[PDB]
UniProtKB/Swiss-Prot annotation:
Changing K51 to A/M: Abolishes kinase activity. This is Epidermal growth factor receptor. It comes from the Eukaryota. It comes from Homo sapiens. The chain holds residues 696 to 1019 of 1210 of the full protein. Ubiquitously expressed. Isoform 2 is also expressed in ovarian cancers. The record marks Y296 as: Important for interaction with PIK3C2B.
Amino acid sequence: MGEAPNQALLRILKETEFKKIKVLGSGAFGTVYKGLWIPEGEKVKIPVAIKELRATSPKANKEILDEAYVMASVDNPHVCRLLGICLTSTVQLIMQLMPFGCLLDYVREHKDNIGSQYLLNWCVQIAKGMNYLEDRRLVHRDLAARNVLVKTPQHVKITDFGRAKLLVPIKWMALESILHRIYTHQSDVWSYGVTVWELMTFGSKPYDGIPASEISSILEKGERLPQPPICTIDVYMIMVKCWMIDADSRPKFRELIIEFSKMARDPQRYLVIQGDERMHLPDEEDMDDVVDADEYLIP
Ligand SMILES: C#Cc1c(-c2cnc3ccccc3c2)c2c(N)ncnc2n1[C@]12CC[C@](NC(=O)c3cncnc3)(CC1)C2
């Protein structure tokens, strides 16, 4: 016995059980649709996001089903679970609709109305989700602001298990990952560091202008990302601790939960943002029987 048996349920969804309403976005990753899932026996309507790829190949469906595996194996409030799969020629992955999109886009568009309370609560929530993945022996290998989804402004979740492994994004990776392809829970802490830096700069591109091949030399010299204008030394020290050369010297995710949650009790002591007190963030026939997927638990 090396590990415990994974007794997760892979739910297979009929094409008749759900309907694509519209396209949300297109990319290299694929095509994501907004939709409504209606389980046949129940009287519920569950808002969903359906992920297709751009052209069916065996290597594509291999990679889709590996994502499904990992995503069906997780259950935590700050981690995106897979609701099910649909067996089209190319496999479709179905999850919870996250109305406000990814956190990177959210901070760029809502830069002017994001308080210190929100930023620090997001740091806690991401640390909780990452700590859960560490408890499940899962290294994420691709934590970034683009792979955090926003259910509400008060509630974010980690996504993207396309690179997640059971124990390329050069500008989010630890030094040992770039040089030697070594990936641990502590290399995810580096990427957490860069993720926090993205949020505190309202979605700036890290090392903007510099090409990816020069990054390893930059980090070996001792250079790191700059202190964001809004950050106190207290917050920037946490980011700098995530980017230590010694991986064991970096914080644990459980420690990051503690540090940010202490800071979240008194947010204006740790982030300095102009006009912080003023900051506010938020079919008819469908709305009658709408249950959010987090309240629709497995029979
Ligand atoms: C990638 C994806 C994605 C996902 C998702 C992730 N992983 C998945 C894994 C398995 C199965 C399905 C998955 C679905 C997602 C979601 N569940 N709910 C809302 N949106 C989502 N997106 C986005 C697609 C376009 C989008 N656009 C904006 O955020 C935007 C742009 N411009 C102005 N405002 C907002 C960027 C990401 C929203």
